[PDB]
Amino acid sequence: DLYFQSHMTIAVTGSIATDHLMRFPGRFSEQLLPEHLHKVSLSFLVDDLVMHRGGVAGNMAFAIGVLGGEVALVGAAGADFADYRDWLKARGVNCDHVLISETAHTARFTCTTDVDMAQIASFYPGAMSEARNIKLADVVSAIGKPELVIIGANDPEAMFLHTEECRKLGLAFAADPSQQLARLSGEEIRRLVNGAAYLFTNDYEWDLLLSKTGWSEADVMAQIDLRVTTLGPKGVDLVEPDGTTIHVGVVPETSQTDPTGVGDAFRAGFLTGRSAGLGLERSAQLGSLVAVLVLESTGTQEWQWDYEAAASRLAGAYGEHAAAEIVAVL
Amino acid sequence: DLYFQSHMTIAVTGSIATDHLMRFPGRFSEQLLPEHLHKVSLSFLVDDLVMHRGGVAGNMAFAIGVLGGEVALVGAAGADFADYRDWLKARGVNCDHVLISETAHTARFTCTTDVDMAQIASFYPGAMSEARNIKLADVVSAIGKPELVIIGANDPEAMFLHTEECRKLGLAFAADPSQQLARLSGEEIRRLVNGAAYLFTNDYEWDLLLSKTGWSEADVMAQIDLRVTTLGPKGVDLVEPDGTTIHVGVVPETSQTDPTGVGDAFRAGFLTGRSAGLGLERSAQLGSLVAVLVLESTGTQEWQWDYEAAASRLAGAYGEHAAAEIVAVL
Numbered sequence: 001d002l003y004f005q006s007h008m009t010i011a012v013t014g015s016i017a018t019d020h021l022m023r024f025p026g027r028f029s030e031q032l033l034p035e036h037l038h039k040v041s042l043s044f045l046v047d048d049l050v051m052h053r054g055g056v057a058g059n060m061a062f063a064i065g066v067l068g069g070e071v072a073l074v075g076a077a078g079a080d081f082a083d084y085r086d087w088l089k090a091r092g093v094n095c096d097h098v099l100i101s102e103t104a105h106t107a108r109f110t111c112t113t114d115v116d117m118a119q120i121a122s123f124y125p126g127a128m129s130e131a132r133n134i135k136l137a138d139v140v141s142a143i144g145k146p147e148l149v150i151i152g153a154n155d156p157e158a159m160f161l162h163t164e165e166c167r168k169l170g171l172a173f174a175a176d177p178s179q180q181l182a183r184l185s186g187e188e189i190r191r192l193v194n195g196a197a198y199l200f201t202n203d204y205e206w207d208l209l210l211s212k213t214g215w216s217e218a219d220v221m222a223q224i225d226l227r228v229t230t231l232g233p234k235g236v237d238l239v240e241p242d243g244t245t246i247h248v249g250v251v252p253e254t255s256q257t258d259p260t261g262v263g264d265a266f267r268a269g270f271l272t273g274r275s276a277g278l279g280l281e282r283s284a285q286l287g288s289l290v291a292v293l294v295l296e297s298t299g300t301q302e303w304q305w306d307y308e309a310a311a312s313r314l315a316g317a318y319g320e321h322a323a324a325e326i327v328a329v330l
Numbered sequence: 331d332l333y334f335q336s337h338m339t340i341a342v343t344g345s346i347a348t349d350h351l352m353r354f355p356g357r358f359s360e361q362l363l364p365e366h367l368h369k370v371s372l373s374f375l376v377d378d379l380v381m382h383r384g385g386v387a388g389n390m391a392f393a394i395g396v397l398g399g400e401v402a403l404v405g406a407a408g409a410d411f412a413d414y415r416d417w418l419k420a421r422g423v424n425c426d427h428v429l430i431s432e433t434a435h436t437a438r439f440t441c442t443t444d445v446d447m448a449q450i451a452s453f454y455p456g457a458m459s460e461a462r463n464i465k466l467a468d469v470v471s472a473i474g475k476p477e478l479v480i481i482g483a484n485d486p487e488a489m490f491l492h493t494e495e496c497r498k499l500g501l502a503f504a505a506d507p508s509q510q511l512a513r514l515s516g517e518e519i520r521r522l523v524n525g526a527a528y529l530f531t532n533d534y535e536w537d538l539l540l541s542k543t544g545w546s547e548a549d550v551m552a553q554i555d556l557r558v559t560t561l562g563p564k565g566v567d568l569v570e571p572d573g574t575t576i577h578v579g580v581v582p583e584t585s586q587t588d589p590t591g592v593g594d595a596f597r598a599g600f601l602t603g604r605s606a607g608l609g610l611e612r613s614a615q616l617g618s619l620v621a622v623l624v625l626e627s628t629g630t631q632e633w634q635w636d637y638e639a640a641a642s643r644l645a646g647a648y649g650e651h652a653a654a655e656i657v658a659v660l
């Protein structure tokens with residue numbers, strides 16, 4: 001692809017939503033009877049309901065912007081998006097390539113979190129379904145070739161069309177299907193993975209992807225450059241095709257407030273570090289910090305970047321060398 | 331209790347809500363990995379979202395009214411309830427004892443149904459929490475002693491207060507905790523059961539109640555007059571303390587459209603038949619018909635009673651004797 005380069009820009013594709021977050025003051029697992037998983041009938045009486053900006057692409061773009069990166073949000077929203085746009089522009093996110101639906105509502109995420117941070121949610125797409133009409137070729141024409149396109153959870157068809165466009169245009173992409181692994185068939189999952197510079201999942205999603213694709217881990221590692229699997233309280237594994245695994249533990253949290261968007265924040269921080277020339281371990285350390293700041297705040301985009309508190313906390317979790325390197329590049 | 335009798339009235343206590351019903355075009359069970367039930371992270375992309383009148387008490391009162399029974403709805407709603415009241419009054423439901431909140435919103439049920447009719451939902455109480463301020467003594471003062479008080483899923487505290495009021499007032503009650511078994515502790519469940527004329531659950535809920543109370547089946551049967559356990563496609567079991575079990579299979583359905591409120595409809599039809607002097611088997615046959623009509627319609631209260639179609643279908647499922655008896659009493 002002989003077209004001109006964007007200056008260090010990440011293009012973030014995926015959902016743009018309003019998040020309705022609720023808390024269940026019990027444990028989902030206690031109500032989940034193995035004997036009955038074939039047909040659950042479950043309704044959780046919640047304590048709390050709060051509304052926040054969301055969507056995986058909105059969350060990740062926000063985080064890249066807060067960290068000072070160049071980032072373009074690519075997704076479909078409803079006519080209400082003008083206000084969300086101002087919020088994202090306040091952190092330096094380029095929103096020029098958001099498709100604004102003429103008729104449909106911005107997507108709605110309705111999520112219940114229990115006391116163990118397990119989550120069970122619905123996602124009503126609305127305008128998200130129009131993302132299949134977005135042409136990444138037009139984005140590239142306007143801003144240049146991105147360093148990386150993130151293929152986040154989106155309209156299912158769009159997830160594939162965007163991946164195919166990256167392949168034919170020679171753009172590096174990150175396969176980041178997260179929540180849609182539940183909706184996507186095995187065939188639909190398998191066609192998103194080949195050639196990915198990164199595959200991101202949490203541990204549950206990794207097992208789910210293997211289960212639904214019928215692939216072994218070796219089948220996956222043969223076709224990607226790096227697997228990144230987050231492990232809840234055990235941190236993150238970064239695994240290369242030759243098996244070399246780098247592990248990074250979490251940043252100790254002060255509160256476990258709301259896990260929504262913690263993975264999105266990790267991905268944003270990690271990819272920011274990678275764009276900034278940091279290695280795998282240093283990038284995942286930075287990612288782990290943004291993750292914990294999202295875990296300690298309600299909502300996905302309700303956290304702040306204070307450079308000296310960040311430096312101090314990185315040093316406290318990983319040593320002074322890591323902290324110096326990381327804050328230095330920001 | 332020497333106070334005067336209401337003419338054949340059932341008092342229905344429980345939730346009054348707006349239901350947001352969505353469909354997931356896959357299978358929850360396929361996404362439920364036994365290995366991971368300790369901490370699920372699940373978000374279902376849905377195809378569909380429709381809004382309907384609901385709440386277990388609204389559903390059951392509606393159904394009793396449609397069948398011609400005398401019924402009083404007892405629960406808490408928001409100021410929007412005026413419109414829902416007109417709908418229920420159109421079927422002969424007495425709504426005089428609904429508590430209308432001055433500040434809170436009518437409760438919200440957000441529910442996703444998969445292709446196997448499994449369901450996963452949140453329930454935001456809003457005004458429902460004010461049901462704990464309702465005194466059944468005042469209801470009884472106004473209308474007389476009901477034949478039966480149904481203790482449906484409600485504000486948790488209200489569920490217990492209502493049961494205690496029935497006990498001290500000598501009113502027959504039906505323990506019908508259904509969905510709240512997930513929210514209620516073992517102690518909170520156990521204090522709802524003793525002295526119940528009927529205990530209603532579906533099969534999943536029966537196992538859940540046994541699991542969380544630590545009780546054996548014998549522990550439960552010693553303290554209730556009848557256990558009624560619905561069995562999905564296998565119908566319903568009606569079990570007496572001495573072990574005598576009467577089983578009734580389903581009415582064959584033409585479509586499996588939406589299972590929300592099927593149990594509510596069964597309960598309403600069964601209790602209507604019992605109030606009308608029908609035996610256990612005939613009552614559960616009538617209940618099974620109302621259940622299937624709700625299964626074949628979207629929403630909980632969007633079905634109709636056509637006496638000749640009802641007679642024909644009852645005869646088709648249970649024989650002409652049952653149909654003649656049942657329609658005769660209506």
Ligand SMILES: NC[C@H]1O[C@@H](n2cnc3c(N)ncnc32)[C@H](O)[C@@H]1O
Nearest residue numbers: 015017054055109123153179261373
């Ligand atoms: N990672 C957290 C973010 O994920 C969004 N989300 C949840 N389920 C989704 C889904 N099934 N499809 C697209 N986006 C989804 C949701 O909007 C939230 O802000």
Ligand SMILES: NC[C@H]1O[C@@H](n2cnc3c(N)ncnc32)[C@H](O)[C@@H]1O
Nearest residue numbers: 043345347384385439453483509591
């Ligand atoms: N049986 C179906 C009815 O149950 C209502 N419902 C669902 N979950 C509930 C819950 N947790 N508490 C009270 N009512 C609930 C819901 O409103 C629906 O109309």
